[PDB]
Design a binder for this molecule. Structure first.
Ligand SMILES: O=c1cnn([C@@H]2O[C@H](COP(=O)(O)O)[C@@H](O)[C@H]2O)c(=O)[nH]1
Ligand SMILES: O=c1cnn([C@@H]2O[C@H](COP(=O)(O)O)[C@@H](O)[C@H]2O)c(=O)[nH]1
Lengths: 219, 218
């Protein structure tokens, strides 16, 4: 599995290149893995991935919530890996063919897929939560090794960990701003994802350091 | 929304030169282009303004928006800043995520299309069973624009029933995925067509052919 420094992944959702680079640089001693999503990519271009690789020694997870038909999913994954992403996040709710399409491209291109199981926001209760255990089981059947699940619902995160097994790699957003606790989340997830609690802080480095101090016995 | 010839081009070529040339070739037949991540991730968001400069066409950003509300808001803002007239949003992530998109669209003078059921085989696993409820959620939220599956006209008809005749309904899966242009237009206001046009030996003839087949439907 990827070796995530300090079990902490930065969700870099600032939408300005200068701010995104400044904040990421400030926390670089604490974090070697950065999740870049569409807020930044749609604002600054896929070349922002290149820029991060150039500036920082960071692994890049493209949080693109891939959620199209197989043919389109293939194209999205190809473009994303071509740009230098180490991994891509993919929805399971569009079904097994859509997921398989991403897995096939990742296998061919030597990169990784993370399957999102249940989302951490309130609206997730409406449809995704009821499908999440089956989505996780589907991932296991398809050979998915990497997953994302919700910090905001420890009971759900625990069940999802059970389904995917201890050997699977599990990351978890919703820590901090959305209400999730770093330590409790790391009972089940391999790494936590943190965005606003760090990138909106007056001192992002102090914020990251504070989170890390709070989980030091788990490192 | 008034779509020329009831035909929306899905421009999923991944090269700027090819995408611009093929769109140019069929410009006399369309005034609405759906641009998705295949093109945007290959050539940048600046491609949207370039399409407007060259063709004056309407632009629907097919970004399958599917994040938490806070992130959805950012995605919609970035997308509308790039000049998109509308954006396609998943309903599966729930009502708050959809509402986030509706907010930005209202703010910037744009439209949200709610995707209810997808057209590929895997849609049967989870989406299809949620689709009627997603459509009702759209109605509850005041959504006026929807997308549904050409490949399942019985499902498309049901979608139409739920949202009513006043709502605007577009439908992908025509051609390559097996859907029929004329049958789909029994229920949808407009059909989306990608590969059957952009991978054709002669895209202009392909477009003309499709239009000829639905001429009695305008
Ligand atoms: O279920 C979820 C919830 N959030 N996110 C993403 O993780 C980050 C959470 O950031 P935050 O710490 O500012 O809440 C954002 O990029 C959000 O899109 C997910 O991928 N899945
Ligand atoms: O349920 C679906 C199926 N396809 N599409 C999109 O519509 C287009 C269909 O293209 P095609 O005519 O080449 O199949 C592609 O951009 C695809 O991502 C959707 O938005 N929803």
């Amino acid at each position: 599995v990827m070796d995530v420094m300090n079990r902490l992944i930065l969700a870099m959702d600032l939408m300005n290149r200068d701010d995104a680079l400044r904040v990421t640089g400030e926390v670089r001693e604490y974090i070697d893995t950065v999740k870049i999503g569409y807020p930044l990519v749609l604002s600054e271009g896929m070349d922002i991935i290149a820029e991060f690789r150039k500036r920082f020694g960071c692994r890049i997870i493209a949080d693109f919530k891939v959620a199209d038909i197989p043919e389109t999913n293939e194209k999205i994954c190809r473009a994303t890996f071509k740009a230098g992403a180490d991994a891509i996040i993919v929805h399971g709710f569009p079904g097994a063919d859509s997921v398989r399409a991403c897995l096939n491209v990742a296998e061919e291109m030597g990169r990784e897929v993370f399957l999102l199981t249940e989302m951490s926001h309130p609206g997730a209760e409406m449809f995704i939560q009821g499908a999440a255990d089956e989505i996780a089981r589907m991932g296991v059947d398809l050979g998915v090794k990497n997953y994302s699940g919700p910090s905001t619902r420890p009971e759900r995160l625990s069940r999802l960990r059970e389904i995917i097994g201890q050997d699977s790699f599990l990351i978890s957003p919703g820590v901090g701003a959305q209400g999730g606790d770093p330590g409790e989340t790391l009972r089940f997830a391999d790494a936590i994802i943190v965005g606003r609690s760090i990138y909106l802080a007056d001192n992002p480095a102090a914020a990251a350091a504070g989170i890390i101090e709070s989980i030091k016995d788990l490192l």
